[PDB]
Coordinates of C-alpha atoms and ligand atoms in Angstrom, one line a residue:
Chain B
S1 CA -0.7 0.0 0.4
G2 CA 1.3 3.3 0.1
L3 CA 0.9 6.1 -2.5
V4 CA 3.4 8.1 -3.8
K5 CA 5.8 10.6 -6.2
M6 CA 7.2 8.1 -8.7
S7 CA 9.2 7.8 -11.2
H8 CA 10.3 5.2 -13.9
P9 CA 14.1 3.5 -13.6
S10 CA 16.3 6.8 -15.3
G11 CA 18.6 3.6 -16.8
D12 CA 17.8 3.2 -20.5
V13 CA 17.2 6.6 -20.7
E14 CA 19.8 7.9 -18.9
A15 CA 22.4 5.6 -21.6
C16 CA 21.3 8.0 -24.2
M17 CA 21.8 11.1 -22.2
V18 CA 25.1 13.8 -23.9
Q19 CA 26.4 16.8 -23.7
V20 CA 26.0 19.3 -26.7
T21 CA 28.5 21.8 -26.5
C22 CA 28.4 24.8 -29.3
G23 CA 31.9 27.5 -28.4
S24 CA 31.3 28.6 -25.1
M25 CA 27.5 27.2 -24.4
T26 CA 27.1 23.6 -22.9
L27 CA 23.6 21.7 -22.9
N28 CA 22.0 18.4 -22.6
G29 CA 21.6 16.3 -25.8
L30 CA 19.2 13.1 -26.5
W31 CA 21.3 10.0 -28.2
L32 CA 18.7 8.3 -29.9
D33 CA 20.1 5.8 -33.5
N34 CA 22.8 8.2 -35.4
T35 CA 20.4 11.7 -34.2
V36 CA 21.0 14.0 -31.1
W37 CA 17.9 15.8 -30.6
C38 CA 18.6 19.0 -28.2
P39 CA 18.1 23.1 -27.9
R40 CA 18.6 25.5 -30.5
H41 CA 19.5 28.3 -27.8
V42 CA 22.9 25.9 -27.4
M43 CA 23.2 28.5 -30.8
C44 CA 22.4 31.7 -29.1
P45 CA 25.3 34.0 -27.0
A46 CA 24.3 34.6 -23.9
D47 CA 24.0 38.5 -25.3
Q48 CA 21.8 37.7 -27.7
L49 CA 18.9 36.0 -25.2
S50 CA 16.6 38.6 -25.5
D51 CA 15.6 39.1 -29.7
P52 CA 18.0 35.3 -30.7
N53 CA 17.7 35.4 -34.6
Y54 CA 17.5 31.5 -35.0
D55 CA 17.7 31.1 -38.3
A56 CA 20.8 33.5 -38.8
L57 CA 22.6 31.2 -36.1
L58 CA 21.5 28.3 -37.9
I59 CA 23.0 29.4 -41.3
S60 CA 26.6 30.5 -39.3
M61 CA 26.9 27.2 -37.9
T62 CA 28.7 23.8 -40.0
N63 CA 29.3 20.9 -38.6
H64 CA 32.6 21.0 -36.5
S65 CA 30.7 24.4 -34.7
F66 CA 29.4 21.5 -32.5
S67 CA 30.8 18.5 -30.4
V68 CA 29.0 16.3 -28.7
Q69 CA 30.2 13.9 -25.9
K70 CA 29.1 11.1 -23.6
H71 CA 30.0 11.0 -21.0
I72 CA 30.5 8.3 -16.9
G73 CA 29.6 5.4 -18.6
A74 CA 30.4 4.1 -21.5
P75 CA 32.4 6.2 -23.5
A76 CA 32.2 7.5 -27.4
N77 CA 33.5 10.0 -29.2
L78 CA 31.0 11.5 -31.8
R79 CA 31.3 13.6 -34.6
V80 CA 28.4 15.8 -35.9
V81 CA 28.3 15.1 -39.9
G82 CA 24.9 16.8 -40.0
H83 CA 22.9 19.4 -38.5
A84 CA 19.5 20.8 -38.4
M85 CA 16.9 23.2 -37.2
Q86 CA 13.0 21.2 -36.6
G87 CA 10.7 24.2 -34.6
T88 CA 12.6 25.2 -31.2
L89 CA 14.9 21.4 -31.4
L90 CA 18.7 20.6 -33.5
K91 CA 18.7 17.9 -35.4
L92 CA 22.4 16.3 -35.7
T93 CA 23.3 13.9 -37.3
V94 CA 26.2 12.1 -36.1
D95 CA 29.1 9.5 -37.4
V96 CA 27.8 6.4 -34.8
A97 CA 24.2 4.7 -34.0
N98 CA 23.9 4.7 -30.4
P99 CA 23.8 1.0 -29.6
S100 CA 22.0 1.0 -26.1
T101 CA 18.2 3.0 -28.2
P102 CA 15.7 2.2 -27.0
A103 CA 12.6 0.7 -28.3
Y104 CA 11.3 4.3 -28.2
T105 CA 8.1 6.8 -29.9
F106 CA 7.3 10.7 -29.8
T107 CA 4.5 11.8 -29.1
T108 CA 2.0 15.5 -27.7
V109 CA 1.4 15.0 -24.4
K110 CA -2.2 16.6 -23.5
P111 CA -3.0 18.6 -20.0
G112 CA -2.5 16.2 -17.2
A113 CA -0.6 13.8 -18.6
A114 CA 2.3 12.9 -16.4
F115 CA 5.8 11.7 -17.4
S116 CA 9.4 11.6 -15.2
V117 CA 11.8 14.2 -16.0
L118 CA 15.9 13.2 -16.2
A119 CA 17.8 16.4 -14.9
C120 CA 20.8 16.5 -16.4
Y121 CA 23.7 19.7 -16.5
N122 CA 27.1 19.2 -18.6
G123 CA 24.7 15.7 -20.6
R124 CA 25.2 14.1 -16.9
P125 CA 21.9 12.6 -14.8
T126 CA 21.8 13.9 -11.9
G127 CA 18.5 13.8 -10.7
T128 CA 15.0 11.9 -11.6
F129 CA 10.7 13.8 -10.5
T130 CA 7.3 13.2 -12.0
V131 CA 5.5 16.1 -13.0
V132 CA 2.3 17.3 -14.9
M133 CA 1.9 18.9 -18.4
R134 CA 0.2 21.4 -16.3
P135 CA -3.9 23.6 -17.9
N136 CA -0.9 26.4 -18.8
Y137 CA 0.8 24.0 -20.5
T138 CA 3.7 24.2 -18.1
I139 CA 5.3 21.8 -15.4
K140 CA 6.3 22.7 -12.2
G141 CA 9.8 20.9 -11.6
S142 CA 13.6 22.0 -10.4
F143 CA 15.7 23.0 -13.3
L144 CA 18.6 25.1 -12.8
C145 CA 20.5 27.3 -15.3
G146 CA 21.8 24.3 -17.9
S147 CA 19.2 22.2 -17.6
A148 CA 18.7 21.9 -20.7
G149 CA 18.1 19.4 -22.4
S150 CA 16.6 16.8 -20.5
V151 CA 14.0 15.0 -21.0
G152 CA 10.7 14.1 -20.3
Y153 CA 8.8 9.9 -21.1
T154 CA 6.8 7.8 -19.6
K155 CA 7.9 3.6 -19.5
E156 CA 4.8 2.1 -21.5
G157 CA 5.8 -1.6 -21.2
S158 CA 9.9 -1.6 -23.0
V159 CA 9.2 1.1 -25.1
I160 CA 10.2 4.8 -24.4
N161 CA 7.5 7.5 -24.8
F162 CA 9.6 10.7 -25.4
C163 CA 7.7 13.6 -24.9
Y164 CA 9.3 16.8 -23.4
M165 CA 12.9 18.0 -23.2
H166 CA 13.6 21.3 -20.9
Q167 CA 13.9 24.1 -22.4
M168 CA 13.0 27.7 -20.0
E169 CA 11.9 28.8 -16.5
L170 CA 9.1 31.1 -17.2
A171 CA 8.5 31.9 -13.7
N172 CA 9.3 30.4 -9.8
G173 CA 9.1 26.9 -9.7
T174 CA 7.3 27.0 -13.7
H175 CA 8.6 25.3 -16.5
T176 CA 7.9 24.8 -19.9
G177 CA 10.0 23.0 -22.7
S178 CA 9.1 21.4 -26.4
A179 CA 8.0 18.4 -28.5
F180 CA 10.6 16.4 -29.8
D181 CA 8.9 17.4 -33.1
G182 CA 10.2 20.3 -32.4
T183 CA 6.7 22.8 -30.8
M184 CA 6.6 24.2 -28.2
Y185 CA 4.0 23.4 -25.6
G186 CA 2.0 26.5 -24.7
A187 CA 3.3 27.7 -28.8
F188 CA 6.0 29.9 -25.5
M189 CA 9.0 31.4 -27.6
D190 CA 12.6 30.6 -26.8
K191 CA 12.9 34.6 -26.7
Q192 CA 14.4 35.8 -23.1
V193 CA 11.4 38.1 -23.1
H194 CA 8.0 38.0 -20.6
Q195 CA 5.7 36.1 -22.2
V196 CA 1.7 35.6 -21.3
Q197 CA 1.1 32.7 -18.9
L198 CA -2.1 31.3 -18.2
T199 CA -3.9 30.4 -15.4
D200 CA -2.7 27.1 -14.5
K201 CA -6.1 24.6 -13.5
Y202 CA -6.7 22.4 -10.6
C203 CA -6.7 18.2 -13.2
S204 CA -10.2 17.3 -12.2
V205 CA -9.6 13.8 -13.3
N206 CA -5.9 13.5 -11.6
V207 CA -7.9 14.5 -8.2
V208 CA -10.5 12.4 -8.7
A209 CA -7.8 8.9 -9.4
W210 CA -6.0 10.7 -5.8
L211 CA -9.4 10.8 -4.3
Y212 CA -9.4 7.0 -5.2
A213 CA -6.0 6.0 -3.9
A214 CA -6.6 7.8 -0.6
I215 CA -10.2 5.2 -0.5
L216 CA -7.8 2.1 -1.2
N217 CA -6.2 2.8 1.3
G218 CA -7.8 3.7 4.3
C219 CA -8.8 7.1 3.9
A220 CA -12.3 7.9 3.1
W221 CA -14.3 10.5 5.7
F222 CA -15.1 12.3 3.0
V223 CA -17.3 9.6 0.7
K224 CA -21.0 10.4 1.6
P225 CA -23.8 9.7 -0.5
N226 CA -24.1 13.1 -2.2
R227 CA -23.7 12.6 -6.1
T228 CA -22.2 15.9 -8.6
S229 CA -22.5 14.9 -12.7
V230 CA -21.0 15.0 -14.7
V231 CA -22.1 18.2 -16.6
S232 CA -22.8 19.5 -13.5
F233 CA -19.5 19.4 -11.9
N234 CA -17.8 21.0 -15.7
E235 CA -19.8 24.1 -15.5
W236 CA -18.6 24.6 -12.1
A237 CA -15.5 23.8 -12.8
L238 CA -15.4 26.7 -15.7
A239 CA -15.9 29.0 -12.7
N240 CA -13.5 27.2 -10.2
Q241 CA -10.2 27.5 -12.7
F242 CA -11.0 23.4 -12.6
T243 CA -10.3 21.1 -15.5
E244 CA -13.9 19.5 -17.6
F245 CA -13.8 15.6 -16.8
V246 CA -13.7 13.4 -19.2
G247 CA -13.8 10.2 -18.0
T248 CA -11.4 7.0 -18.7
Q249 CA -11.3 3.0 -18.2
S250 CA -8.7 3.4 -16.1
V251 CA -10.9 6.0 -13.8
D252 CA -13.7 3.3 -14.3
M253 CA -11.8 0.6 -12.6
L254 CA -11.4 2.7 -10.0
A255 CA -14.8 3.3 -9.3
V256 CA -16.0 -0.5 -9.0
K257 CA -12.9 -1.0 -7.1
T258 CA -13.9 0.7 -4.2
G259 CA -17.5 1.3 -5.2
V260 CA -17.1 4.4 -4.6
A261 CA -19.2 6.6 -8.2
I262 CA -16.9 9.0 -10.2
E263 CA -20.6 11.8 -9.0
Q264 CA -19.6 10.9 -5.5
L265 CA -16.1 12.7 -5.6
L266 CA -17.5 14.9 -7.9
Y267 CA -19.3 16.1 -5.3
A268 CA -16.1 16.1 -2.2
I269 CA -14.0 17.7 -5.1
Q270 CA -16.3 20.8 -4.8
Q271 CA -16.2 20.8 -0.9
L272 CA -12.6 19.9 -0.3
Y273 CA -12.0 22.8 -2.4
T274 CA -13.5 24.9 0.1
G275 CA -11.8 23.2 3.0
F276 CA -10.0 20.2 3.9
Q277 CA -12.7 20.5 8.0
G278 CA -8.9 20.2 9.6
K279 CA -8.5 17.0 8.2
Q280 CA -5.7 15.1 6.5
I281 CA -6.5 13.0 2.9
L282 CA -2.6 10.6 2.6
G283 CA -1.0 13.3 4.9
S284 CA -2.4 16.0 2.3
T285 CA -4.5 19.1 3.4
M286 CA -4.8 20.4 0.0
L287 CA -6.3 18.3 -3.1
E288 CA -3.3 16.6 -5.1
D289 CA -3.3 16.7 -9.0
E290 CA -0.3 15.2 -10.3
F291 CA -1.5 11.8 -9.6
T292 CA -2.8 10.0 -13.3
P293 CA -5.3 7.2 -12.7
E294 CA -3.4 5.3 -14.6
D295 CA -0.9 6.4 -11.7
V296 CA -3.4 5.1 -9.3
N297 CA -3.5 1.7 -10.8
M298 CA -0.4 1.2 -11.1
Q299 CA 0.3 1.9 -7.5
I300 CA -3.0 0.2 -5.9
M301 CA -1.9 -3.0 -8.2
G302 CA -3.9 -6.8 -7.0
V303 CA -6.0 -9.8 -8.3
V304 CA -9.4 -9.9 -8.7
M305 CA -11.6 -12.3 -8.0
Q306 CA -13.8 -12.9 -10.3
Chain M
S1 CA 14.4 27.3 -9.0
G2 CA 11.4 25.1 -7.9
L3 CA 11.5 22.1 -5.0
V4 CA 10.3 19.1 -5.7
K5 CA 10.7 14.7 -5.2
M6 CA 13.7 14.1 -7.0
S7 CA 15.2 11.1 -6.8
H8 CA 18.7 10.0 -7.8
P9 CA 18.7 8.2 -11.4
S10 CA 19.4 4.9 -11.1
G11 CA 20.7 3.4 -14.2
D12 CA 23.4 2.6 -11.0
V13 CA 21.8 0.3 -9.2
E14 CA 19.3 -1.4 -12.1
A15 CA 22.6 -2.8 -13.4
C16 CA 23.0 -4.6 -9.5
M17 CA 19.3 -5.7 -9.0
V18 CA 18.5 -9.9 -9.6
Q19 CA 15.9 -12.5 -8.8
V20 CA 16.6 -14.4 -6.0
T21 CA 14.0 -18.1 -6.4
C22 CA 14.0 -20.0 -3.1
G23 CA 11.5 -22.3 -3.1
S24 CA 7.6 -21.2 -5.1
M25 CA 9.4 -17.8 -3.5
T26 CA 10.7 -15.2 -5.1
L27 CA 12.1 -11.9 -3.9
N28 CA 14.8 -9.0 -5.4
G29 CA 18.0 -9.1 -4.5
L30 CA 21.1 -7.4 -5.2
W31 CA 24.1 -8.3 -6.7
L32 CA 27.7 -6.8 -5.8
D33 CA 31.1 -8.7 -6.9
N34 CA 30.2 -12.2 -6.7
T35 CA 27.9 -11.5 -3.3
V36 CA 24.2 -11.4 -3.8
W37 CA 21.9 -9.8 -0.9
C38 CA 17.9 -9.7 -0.7
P39 CA 15.8 -11.0 2.2
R40 CA 15.6 -13.6 4.4
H41 CA 11.9 -14.3 4.5
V42 CA 12.6 -15.4 0.6
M43 CA 13.8 -19.5 2.8
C44 CA 9.2 -18.6 4.5
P45 CA 7.1 -20.9 2.9
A46 CA 3.7 -18.7 1.7
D47 CA 2.0 -20.3 4.5
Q48 CA 4.9 -19.4 7.2
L49 CA 5.2 -15.8 6.6
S50 CA 3.1 -15.2 10.3
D51 CA 6.0 -17.7 12.1
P52 CA 8.8 -18.8 10.9
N53 CA 11.2 -20.8 11.4
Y54 CA 14.3 -19.6 10.5
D55 CA 16.9 -21.3 11.6
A56 CA 15.1 -24.2 10.7
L57 CA 14.6 -22.8 7.1
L58 CA 18.2 -22.0 7.1
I59 CA 19.5 -26.1 8.4
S60 CA 17.2 -27.0 5.0
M61 CA 18.5 -24.9 2.2
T62 CA 21.5 -25.5 0.3
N63 CA 23.1 -24.0 -2.9
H64 CA 21.2 -25.9 -5.0
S65 CA 17.2 -24.4 -2.9
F66 CA 18.4 -20.6 -4.8
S67 CA 17.9 -19.5 -8.5
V68 CA 19.1 -16.1 -9.2
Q69 CA 18.4 -14.9 -12.9
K70 CA 19.3 -11.2 -13.8
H71 CA 16.8 -10.0 -16.1
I72 CA 17.9 -6.5 -17.5
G73 CA 20.8 -5.3 -19.9
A74 CA 23.1 -9.2 -20.6
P75 CA 20.8 -11.9 -19.1
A76 CA 22.4 -14.0 -16.6
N77 CA 21.7 -17.3 -14.7
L78 CA 24.0 -16.8 -12.0
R79 CA 25.2 -20.5 -10.1
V80 CA 25.5 -20.0 -6.4
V81 CA 27.9 -22.0 -4.7
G82 CA 27.6 -20.7 -1.5
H83 CA 24.5 -18.5 1.5
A84 CA 24.8 -17.3 5.0
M85 CA 22.5 -15.4 7.2
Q86 CA 23.3 -11.9 8.0
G87 CA 20.6 -11.0 10.3
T88 CA 17.5 -10.3 8.7
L89 CA 19.1 -10.8 5.1
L90 CA 20.4 -14.2 3.5
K91 CA 24.1 -13.4 1.8
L92 CA 24.3 -15.4 -1.2
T93 CA 27.7 -16.5 -3.0
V94 CA 27.9 -16.9 -6.9
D95 CA 30.1 -18.4 -9.6
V96 CA 30.5 -14.7 -11.5
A97 CA 31.1 -11.8 -10.5
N98 CA 28.9 -8.1 -11.8
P99 CA 30.7 -6.5 -13.9
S100 CA 28.6 -3.8 -13.5
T101 CA 29.8 -3.2 -9.8
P102 CA 29.7 0.4 -9.2
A103 CA 31.7 1.8 -6.4
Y104 CA 29.3 1.8 -3.2
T105 CA 29.7 1.7 0.7
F106 CA 27.3 1.0 3.0
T107 CA 25.6 2.9 5.7
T108 CA 22.7 3.0 8.1
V109 CA 20.9 6.6 8.1
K110 CA 19.7 8.0 11.0
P111 CA 15.9 9.4 11.3
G112 CA 15.5 12.5 9.4
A113 CA 18.4 11.3 6.6
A114 CA 16.5 10.6 2.6
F115 CA 17.9 7.9 0.3
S116 CA 16.2 7.3 -3.3
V117 CA 14.4 3.9 -3.0
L118 CA 14.1 1.3 -6.5
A119 CA 11.2 -0.6 -6.4
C120 CA 11.0 -3.7 -8.6
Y121 CA 9.4 -7.1 -8.5
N122 CA 10.9 -10.0 -10.0
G123 CA 13.9 -8.5 -9.9
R124 CA 12.5 -6.0 -12.5
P125 CA 12.9 -2.6 -11.4
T126 CA 9.6 -0.5 -11.7
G127 CA 10.0 2.5 -10.6
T128 CA 12.6 4.8 -8.0
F129 CA 10.9 7.8 -5.4
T130 CA 12.4 9.5 -2.4
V131 CA 12.2 9.1 1.4
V132 CA 12.8 9.5 4.5
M133 CA 13.8 7.1 7.5
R134 CA 11.0 8.3 10.4
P135 CA 12.3 9.1 14.1
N136 CA 10.0 6.1 14.4
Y137 CA 12.1 4.3 11.8
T138 CA 9.9 3.5 9.7
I139 CA 9.7 4.7 5.4
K140 CA 6.3 5.8 4.3
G141 CA 6.6 3.9 0.1
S142 CA 5.0 3.5 -1.9
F143 CA 5.7 -1.1 -1.9
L144 CA 3.1 -3.7 -3.3
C145 CA 4.0 -7.6 -2.3
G146 CA 7.4 -9.0 -3.6
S147 CA 8.6 -5.5 -3.7
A148 CA 11.1 -6.4 -0.9
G149 CA 14.7 -7.2 -2.1
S150 CA 14.3 -3.7 -2.6
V151 CA 17.3 -0.7 -1.8
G152 CA 17.7 2.1 -0.3
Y153 CA 20.3 4.5 -1.4
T154 CA 21.7 7.3 -2.1
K155 CA 25.2 9.4 -3.9
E156 CA 28.4 10.9 -1.9
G157 CA 29.7 12.0 -5.0
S158 CA 30.5 9.0 -7.2
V159 CA 30.4 6.3 -4.4
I160 CA 26.9 4.7 -4.0
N161 CA 26.2 4.2 -0.5
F162 CA 23.2 1.4 0.4
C163 CA 21.4 1.5 3.3
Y164 CA 17.9 -0.2 3.3
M165 CA 16.8 -2.9 1.8
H166 CA 12.6 -3.2 1.5
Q167 CA 11.6 -5.8 3.9
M168 CA 8.1 -5.4 5.5
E169 CA 4.5 -3.5 5.9
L170 CA 3.8 -2.8 9.5
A171 CA 0.8 -0.8 8.7
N172 CA -0.7 1.6 5.9
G173 CA 1.9 2.7 4.6
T174 CA 4.4 2.1 6.6
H175 CA 6.7 0.6 5.6
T176 CA 10.5 -0.8 7.2
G177 CA 13.3 -2.5 6.1
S178 CA 16.8 -3.4 7.8
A179 CA 20.5 -2.3 6.9
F180 CA 22.6 -4.0 4.9
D181 CA 24.1 -6.0 8.0
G182 CA 21.5 -7.6 8.8
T183 CA 20.3 -5.6 11.6
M184 CA 16.2 -4.4 10.4
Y185 CA 15.3 -0.5 11.3
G186 CA 13.6 0.0 14.3
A187 CA 14.0 -3.4 16.0
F188 CA 10.9 -5.1 13.2
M189 CA 11.0 -8.8 13.3
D190 CA 10.7 -9.7 9.9
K191 CA 7.1 -12.2 10.1
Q192 CA 3.5 -11.0 9.7
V193 CA 2.5 -10.3 13.1
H194 CA 1.3 -7.2 14.5
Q195 CA 3.6 -5.0 15.4
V196 CA 2.5 -1.5 17.4
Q197 CA 5.1 1.0 16.2
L198 CA 6.6 4.0 18.4
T199 CA 5.1 7.9 18.0
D200 CA 6.9 9.9 15.0
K201 CA 7.6 13.2 15.0
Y202 CA 9.2 15.6 13.2
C203 CA 12.7 15.9 11.3
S204 CA 13.2 19.9 13.0
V205 CA 16.1 19.7 10.9
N206 CA 14.3 19.1 7.6
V207 CA 11.8 22.0 8.7
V208 CA 13.4 24.3 8.5
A209 CA 15.8 23.4 5.6
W210 CA 12.0 23.5 3.4
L211 CA 11.3 26.9 5.2
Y212 CA 14.5 27.6 3.6
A213 CA 13.8 26.8 0.4
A214 CA 10.4 27.8 0.7
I215 CA 12.3 31.3 1.0
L216 CA 14.2 31.0 -2.2
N217 CA 11.7 30.1 -3.6
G218 CA 9.3 33.8 -2.7
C219 CA 7.7 32.0 0.1
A220 CA 9.2 33.6 3.0
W221 CA 5.4 35.0 4.8
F222 CA 6.2 33.1 8.2
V223 CA 9.4 34.7 8.9
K224 CA 9.5 37.1 11.6
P225 CA 11.5 39.0 13.7
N226 CA 11.1 36.2 16.9
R227 CA 13.7 34.0 17.2
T228 CA 13.4 30.8 19.6
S229 CA 17.2 29.7 20.5
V230 CA 18.5 26.0 19.5
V231 CA 18.8 24.7 23.1
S232 CA 15.0 26.5 24.2
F233 CA 13.3 24.9 20.9
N234 CA 15.0 21.7 21.8
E235 CA 13.2 21.8 25.3
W236 CA 9.6 22.6 23.5
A237 CA 10.3 19.6 20.8
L238 CA 11.0 17.0 23.9
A239 CA 6.7 17.8 24.4
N240 CA 5.5 18.7 21.5
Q241 CA 6.2 15.0 18.8
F242 CA 9.9 17.1 16.8
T243 CA 13.6 15.5 16.7
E244 CA 16.3 17.7 18.8
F245 CA 17.4 20.4 16.4
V246 CA 20.5 19.6 15.2
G247 CA 22.4 21.9 13.0
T248 CA 24.9 21.1 9.9
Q249 CA 27.4 23.5 8.1
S250 CA 24.3 22.5 5.7
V251 CA 22.1 24.2 7.5
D252 CA 24.6 27.2 7.2
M253 CA 24.7 27.5 4.2
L254 CA 21.1 27.8 3.5
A255 CA 21.1 30.5 6.5
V256 CA 24.1 32.7 4.8
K257 CA 21.7 32.6 0.5
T258 CA 18.4 34.0 2.9
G259 CA 19.5 35.8 5.8
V260 CA 17.3 34.4 7.8
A261 CA 18.4 32.8 11.0
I262 CA 17.2 29.2 12.2
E263 CA 16.4 30.7 15.2
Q264 CA 14.4 32.9 13.1
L265 CA 12.6 29.3 11.6
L266 CA 12.8 28.1 15.2
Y267 CA 10.0 30.0 16.2
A268 CA 8.7 30.1 13.4
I269 CA 8.3 26.5 13.2
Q270 CA 6.6 26.7 17.0
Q271 CA 3.7 28.8 15.1
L272 CA 2.9 27.3 12.4
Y273 CA 2.7 23.7 14.2
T274 CA -0.4 25.2 15.5
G275 CA -2.3 25.1 11.2
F276 CA -1.1 27.7 8.9
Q277 CA -4.3 29.3 9.4
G278 CA -5.6 29.1 5.3
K279 CA -2.1 29.9 4.2
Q280 CA -0.1 27.4 2.5
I281 CA 3.7 27.0 2.2
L282 CA 5.1 25.5 -1.1
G283 CA 1.6 24.7 -2.1
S284 CA 1.2 22.4 1.9
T285 CA -0.7 24.2 3.8
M286 CA 0.7 21.9 6.5
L287 CA 4.3 21.7 7.8
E288 CA 7.3 19.5 5.1
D289 CA 9.9 17.1 6.6
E290 CA 11.1 14.8 3.9
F291 CA 13.9 17.6 2.3
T292 CA 16.6 17.8 3.6
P293 CA 18.7 20.2 4.0
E294 CA 21.4 19.0 1.7
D295 CA 18.3 18.0 -0.8
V296 CA 17.4 21.4 -0.5
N297 CA 21.3 23.5 -1.5
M298 CA 21.5 20.6 -4.2
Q299 CA 18.1 21.7 -5.8
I300 CA 18.8 25.4 -5.3
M301 CA 22.1 26.2 -6.0
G302 CA 22.8 23.4 -7.6
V303 CA 25.5 22.7 -4.4
Ligands
LIG401 NA1 29.3 31.1 -2.7

């Protein structure tokens, strides 16, 4: 039993991290087969971060302008034999295919989806943590200068789903990056100017999952016969900065496992939003919305008598 | 900026995890050099977990009674050439040394110390998280049946400090394990019986690090000019379920950076203890004692 912030084992992603140097800038990179992905502002000098001309900087670059190094486990000498820019990322081609290339895929995650983050500095993994793509297309991580290139991913069986490469920090604790198709999450720009940040929202489906996890852990004082329909909750959610609830199979297994209907937890959220009545839920006195239904189903597994 | 629950990269430890099968019981093992560490109750059958006779079980075991397999990376079958019994842990000796053995030592963590846990099932790593050795010598993790043998560890430079091998679930959400000398944290026995746990406490030094982390992240409304001395706070701590505060160089670095004194946060802890009254610190309306001063230092200032 128990529920904690859990991240995938970083082992196979650790084997793909590299150090990307362009002139006097050093950032992290992702090495898959003969391709090395990295943020495109590694080309930018420190004095040009306010208004960078990425197209002119790319033209000025050559293959020798970029150096890729592999640190710690497994030594590698990499020669950049090609370079191209895709959106806000750089697509470097190297002479050596990564022998530890896992089965992988690329997906642009929706708000509310969770993924593991491998924070790296100068190509060296330094820590891992799980974040959730916020409704305002940011993430609440722990990044310092030089963490650009750190990758966000999920593990489904043996397939790694790369979905995030860190880029920038917009406010205290608030970060954002780009998907591996080059598009930045939330249409943000890799420009050091002020940008519009939308208001965050509580992920309703994750709070429901977190309450199911609490019920499954002997904490269900908040459960009452009172019910709030999905339609009525979603109208209430618009006025109270909550995401629209959309039921999935993952949430239905939790409703069946506990015997508590979704509409009961939807009502409980409306009450708990006002206050926890001095009580606690899984040691928390505030709503938790970074636990997805899929994460709860993974931490509270069990045999099912049929 | 930002403060999150962070764990060390588990890649080094992942290469040392193996599966240990003894009869119809399967647990997790730690493969270092020619030694494989695993919990001793892998010897016990599924029906004798309540009152196991480990003396009789160990005597009835042979080198052939243990099957060790490595799944991640290069798959391998390990031949057990010897087995010893150390406290609550089984010490297996295999014929092949782990070529991925990292620089490692063994440490016994004190209450308040944090470490990363690699949760494993059937010798396969499934997730990692960070816990803190509670003052009552438990940990608040997320374990299911078969997570025994999962290892807790820290990283001090380039050497991994193995400090915890998971053993059992004492109560709901409450777990405990043994150090790698066989000593179980909190003297809990490895038997499926109800065991009374000592009353938990707040890790005073970690709450201070968490308050220091909040100041460094734009949250310092709790800071006041009043000060409670370390001696005055520790006497107050003895009667309010708080651990004794012991300042370290790591806490001092936070005091120098934020310019807020330790005794300022010690007084604020006394005020925040009786409730936050609607206000929240770093997104929490309760005290957080799972962020160590070394964790806050590394996360906010990269040291
Ligand atoms: Na300094």
